Write a protein that binds this ligand. Structure first.
Ligand SMILES: [Cl-]
Ligand SMILES: [Cl-]
Length: 162
């Protein structure tokens, strides 16, 4: 298992514009297009991302291409973030994947907001961090996905995904 497979499990794949769990326009493998309520605006962002007139529908290869960019950007975003980098550097391979997942989903700013859990992860206090992570809107809104990510941090294994 790896980050790509993990996120493909958490986000799914949709080839037509859809609304995410928050009601935002998305496409592919969790690629947010816009927070604006307007479908046109969504379509416009889509065309600009793909580089052709898509009419709201993309192919599988296009979806995977956005996906590669988004994962790459997430990693690079962690590495540039003063608060995140040190956490990431401190972790093992499995748990690094858990942190990338969260950043892909909520953005770096959002993750950097879990200050306490981050310190706990850096200190390798697994159980405590897991409890702290669960007390968040994130967990209350997407509990099953959150639970998977949190077990991964707790255990350092991919069991939640097998
Ligand atoms: Cl883009
Ligand atoms: Cl969920």
């Amino acid at each position: 298992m790896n980050i790509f497979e993990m996120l493909r499990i958490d986000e799914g794949l949709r080839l037509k514009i859809y609304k995410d769990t928050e009601g935002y326009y998305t496409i592919g493998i969790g690629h947010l297009l816009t927070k604006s309520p307007s479908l046109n605006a969504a379509k416009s962002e889509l065309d600009k991302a793909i580089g052709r007139n898509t009419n709201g529908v993309i192919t599988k290869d296009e979806a995977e291409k956005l996906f590669n960019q988004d994962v790459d950007a997430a990693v690079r975003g962690i590495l540039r973030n003063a608060k995140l980098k040190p956490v990431y550097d401190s972790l093992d391979a499995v748990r690094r994947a858990a942190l990338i997942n969260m950043v892909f989903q909520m953005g770096e700013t959002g993750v950097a907001g879990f200050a306490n859990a981050l310190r706990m992860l850096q200190q390798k206090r697994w159980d405590e961090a897991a409890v702290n992570l669960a007390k968040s809107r994130w967990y209350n809104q997407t509990p099953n996905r959150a639970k998977r990510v949190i077990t991964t941090f707790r255990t350092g294994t991919w069991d939640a995904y097998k």
